[PDB]
Paper text:
The continuity of the strand β1 of crystal form 1 is compromised due to the adoption by Leu327 of two distinct conformations, with only one of them providing extension of the strand. The core of the dimer interaction interface of crystal form 1 of GspLfld is almost purely hydrophobic. On the α1 side, close to the N-terminus of the helix, the side chains of Leu306 and Ala313′ establish a heterotypic interaction which is complemented by Ile316′. On the opposite side of the interface another hydrophobic clamp is formed by Phe329, Leu327a′ and Val324′, the residues belonging to strand β1. The core of the interface is constituted by two interactions between symmetry related residues: the first involving Leu309 and the second involving b-conformers of Leu327 (bottom panel seen clockwise from top left). The distance between the main chain atoms of β1 and β1′ of crystal form 1 is in the range of 4.5–5.0 Å and is drastically greater than the equivalent interdomain in crystal form 2, which are instead within hydrogen bonding distances (2.8–3.0 Å). The electron density of the inter-strand region of crystal form 1 has revealed the presence of an ordered water molecule positioned halfway between the main chain nitrogen of Leu327 and the carbonyl oxygen of Phe329′ (red sphere). In this regard, crystal form 2 and the V. parahaemolyticus crystal form of GspLfld appear as closed versions of the dimer whereas crystal form 1 exploits a novel conformation, resulting in an open variant of the interface. Nevertheless, the GspLfld dimer is capable of subtle opening of the interface, which does not affect its hydrophobic core but perturbs extension of antiparallel β-sheet, as documented by crystal form 1.
In our studies we have focused on the periplasmic segment of [name] (historically called [name]) from [name], GspLperi, which consists of two domains: a membrane proximal domain (MPD) connected via a short linker to a ferredoxin-like domain (FLD). The inner-membrane bitopic protein [name] can be considered a central player in the T2SS because it appears to interact extensively with other components of the system. Even though the exact mode of secretion via T2SS has not been fully elucidated, the role of [name] is anticipated to help in linking adenosine triphosphate (ATP) hydrolysis to the assembly of the pseudopilus, which together constitute the two crucial steps in exoprotein transport. In this work we presented two distinct crystal structures of GspLfld, which in combination with the crystal structure of GspLfld from Vibrio parahaemolyticus, provide direct evidence for the conservation of a hydrophobic dimer interface.
Author numbering:
A (entry chain A), B (entry chain A): 303 to 382
The structure:
Amino acid sequence: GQLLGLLGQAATVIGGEPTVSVEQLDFSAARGDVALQVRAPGFDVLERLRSRLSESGLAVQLGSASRDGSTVSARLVIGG
Amino acid sequence: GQLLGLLGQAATVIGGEPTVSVEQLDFSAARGDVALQVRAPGFDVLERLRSRLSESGLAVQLGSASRDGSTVSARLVIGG
Ligand SMILES: [Br-]
Ligand SMILES: [Br-]
Ligand SMILES: [Br-]
Ligand SMILES: [Br-]
Ligand SMILES: [Br-]
Ligand SMILES: [Br-]
């Protein structure tokens, strides 16, 4: 039982990004992962966030991205 | 936009409790709160966790508790 700590680290890293907002999350104790629906100004900020999460030791996948107006929405799955 | 940081602090505090497991959570960016379905050995551990969360500066409510076998299930709502 450590997954909520993973969301802790992700919370620090994502908190370090002013341009990113977390619209949704899907915490699955069964699957052993947590999904974050996040929004950013562009895809490069999203890749910066995935890189920072991966460098902090977390297993992270970034996908399901699409631009909607002035922002881009994507899914960051933390956990392995 | 600071609610995910609230889940960060709650993640530290709850991580400091070996007897407590987080079975569910309900992250509501709209309502400005997050709900945690947690399990513990007894109600006193639950009140210890609510007290530690409240003392760390978080607004927390503990309720909807019921014993089911050897453990007790309850709802901790963080956010105000
Ligand atoms: Br946010
Ligand atoms: Br871009
Ligand atoms: Br991980
Ligand atoms: Br846990
Ligand atoms: Br008790
Ligand atoms: Br709060």
